[PDB]
């Protein structure tokens, strides 16, 4: 039923892109159904984080959602043209205003736990922004990048997703499946 939840409650472009990423990783969205939901949720937050934000050129470049080949193509181009340090792992966005990459985490555990996992892996100039399903966020140097309204929008979406999962008795399983 999580499969059904995902196809019923995410935009179909998001679900198609989540399927695509799983196939590239070698994982079956028909089996790893909680991960499927997590990938959809994370992609949606990436798209929400970028949407409506301009400098009209887009303020953010979206890296998540692209396959690895295209994602490195875009990262390489940005590093070449801006001189910013090249990350050793693919991040989620680039912020043309602050000239830094951003790694987005969406977590169903303590926000600090997920923050430390990302940071332990990043080893540095990539900015980290973690959101939870409880309304909490944590970001590097307490710098949340976006305005308060745009963050509230993401938080509301996460609030809504949690509430609907719980109505279908999908939340408890989903929540306990997260591991780093
Ligand atoms: C890099 C990677 C991410 N994912 C998932 C974990 C997260 O739910 C989602 C977003 O990843 P991220 O926070 O590392 O950008 O994609 C995989 O399933 N396999 C992978 O190799
Ligand atoms: Mn990513
Ligand atoms: Mn991420």
Numbering used by the authors: 0 to 54, 72 to 139, 141 to 197
How does the study describe this entry?
Influenza virus replicates in the nucleus of infected cells where the heterotrimeric viral RNA-dependent RNA polymerase, with subunits PA, PB1 and PB2, is responsible for replication and transcription of the single-stranded viral RNA genome (vRNA). For influenza, cap-snatching involves the binding of host cell pre-mRNAs via their 5′ cap structure to the PB2 subunit of the polymerase followed by cleavage at nucleotides 10–13 by an endonuclease activity which resides in the PA subunit of the polymerase. The endonuclease domain is at the N-terminus of the PA subunit and has a core fold similar to other two-metal dependent nucleases of the PD…D/E…K superfamily. Here we describe high resolution X-ray co-crystal structures of the 2009 pandemic H1N1 (pH1N1) PA endonuclease domain with a series of specific inhibitors, including four diketo compounds and a green tea catechin, all of which chelate the two critical manganese ions in the active site of the enzyme.
